[PDB]
Amino acid sequence: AVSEHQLLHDKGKSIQDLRRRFFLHHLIAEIHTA
């Protein structure tokens, strides 16, 4: 049920989810230049 401001309000699309794409990648994948 997308909303109106959405899209214009990108903040909400698969960004909160792109995060869950990193979810484990973040808590289990990230080395500041060794």
CSV table of N, CA and C in Angstrom, one decimal:
chain,number,residue,atom,x,y,z
A,1,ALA,N,0.9,-1.2,0.0
A,1,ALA,CA,0.0,0.0,0.0
A,1,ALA,C,0.9,1.2,0.0
A,2,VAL,N,1.7,1.4,-1.0
A,2,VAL,CA,2.6,2.6,-1.0
A,2,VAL,C,1.8,3.8,-0.7
A,3,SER,N,2.5,4.9,-0.2
A,3,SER,CA,1.7,6.1,0.1
A,3,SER,C,2.0,7.2,-1.0
A,4,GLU,N,1.5,8.4,-0.8
A,4,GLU,CA,1.7,9.4,-1.8
A,4,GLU,C,3.1,10.0,-1.6
A,5,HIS,N,3.4,10.7,-0.6
A,5,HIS,CA,4.7,11.3,-0.3
A,5,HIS,C,5.8,10.3,-0.6
A,6,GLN,N,5.5,9.1,-0.4
A,6,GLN,CA,6.5,8.0,-0.7
A,6,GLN,C,7.1,8.3,-2.1
A,7,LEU,N,8.1,7.7,-2.5
A,7,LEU,CA,8.7,8.0,-3.9
A,7,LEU,C,9.3,9.4,-3.7
A,8,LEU,N,8.5,10.4,-3.6
A,8,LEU,CA,9.1,11.7,-3.4
A,8,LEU,C,9.9,11.6,-2.0
A,9,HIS,N,9.3,10.8,-1.2
A,9,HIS,CA,9.9,10.6,0.2
A,9,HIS,C,10.7,9.3,0.1
A,10,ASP,N,11.5,9.1,-0.9
A,10,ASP,CA,12.3,7.8,-1.0
A,10,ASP,C,12.6,7.2,0.4
A,11,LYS,N,13.0,8.0,1.3
A,11,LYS,CA,13.3,7.5,2.7
A,11,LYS,C,12.2,6.6,3.1
A,12,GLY,N,12.4,5.3,2.9
A,12,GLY,CA,11.3,4.3,3.2
A,12,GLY,C,11.4,3.1,2.3
A,13,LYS,N,11.7,3.4,1.0
A,13,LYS,CA,11.8,2.3,0.0
A,13,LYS,C,12.8,1.3,0.5
A,14,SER,N,13.3,0.4,-0.3
A,14,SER,CA,14.3,-0.6,0.1
A,14,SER,C,15.6,0.1,0.5
A,15,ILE,N,15.5,0.9,1.4
A,15,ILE,CA,16.7,1.6,2.0
A,15,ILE,C,16.7,1.1,3.4
A,16,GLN,N,15.6,1.2,4.0
A,16,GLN,CA,15.5,0.6,5.4
A,16,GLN,C,15.7,-0.9,5.2
A,17,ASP,N,15.4,-1.4,4.0
A,17,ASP,CA,15.6,-2.8,3.6
A,17,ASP,C,17.0,-2.9,3.1
A,18,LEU,N,17.5,-2.1,2.2
A,18,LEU,CA,18.9,-2.2,1.7
A,18,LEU,C,19.8,-2.3,2.9
A,19,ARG,N,19.3,-1.8,4.0
A,19,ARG,CA,20.0,-1.9,5.3
A,19,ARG,C,20.0,-3.4,5.7
A,20,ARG,N,18.8,-4.0,5.7
A,20,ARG,CA,18.7,-5.4,6.1
A,20,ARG,C,19.5,-6.2,5.1
A,21,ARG,N,19.9,-5.7,4.0
A,21,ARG,CA,20.7,-6.4,3.0
A,21,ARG,C,22.1,-6.4,3.6
A,22,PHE,N,22.4,-5.3,4.3
A,22,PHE,CA,23.7,-5.2,5.0
A,22,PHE,C,23.6,-5.8,6.4
A,23,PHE,N,22.3,-5.8,6.9
A,23,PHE,CA,22.0,-6.2,8.3
A,23,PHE,C,23.1,-7.1,8.8
A,24,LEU,N,23.2,-8.4,8.4
A,24,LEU,CA,24.3,-9.3,8.8
A,24,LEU,C,25.6,-8.8,8.2
A,25,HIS,N,25.6,-8.3,7.0
A,25,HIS,CA,26.8,-7.9,6.3
A,25,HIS,C,27.5,-6.8,7.2
A,26,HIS,N,26.7,-6.1,7.9
A,26,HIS,CA,27.3,-5.0,8.8
A,26,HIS,C,27.8,-5.6,10.1
A,27,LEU,N,26.9,-6.3,10.8
A,27,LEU,CA,27.3,-6.9,12.1
A,27,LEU,C,28.3,-8.1,11.8
A,28,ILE,N,28.4,-8.5,10.6
A,28,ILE,CA,29.3,-9.6,10.2
A,28,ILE,C,30.0,-9.4,8.9
A,29,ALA,N,30.7,-8.3,8.7
A,29,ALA,CA,31.4,-8.0,7.4
A,29,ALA,C,31.7,-6.5,7.3
A,30,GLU,N,32.9,-6.2,7.7
A,30,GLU,CA,33.3,-4.7,7.7
A,30,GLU,C,34.7,-4.5,8.3
A,31,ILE,N,35.7,-4.3,7.5
A,31,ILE,CA,37.1,-4.1,8.1
A,31,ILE,C,37.6,-2.8,7.6
A,32,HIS,N,37.7,-1.8,8.5
A,32,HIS,CA,38.3,-0.5,8.1
A,32,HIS,C,39.7,-0.7,7.5
A,33,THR,N,39.9,-0.9,6.3
A,33,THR,CA,41.2,-1.1,5.7
A,33,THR,C,42.1,-2.0,6.6
A,34,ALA,N,41.6,-3.2,7.0
A,34,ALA,CA,42.4,-4.0,7.9
A,34,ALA,C,42.6,-3.3,9.2
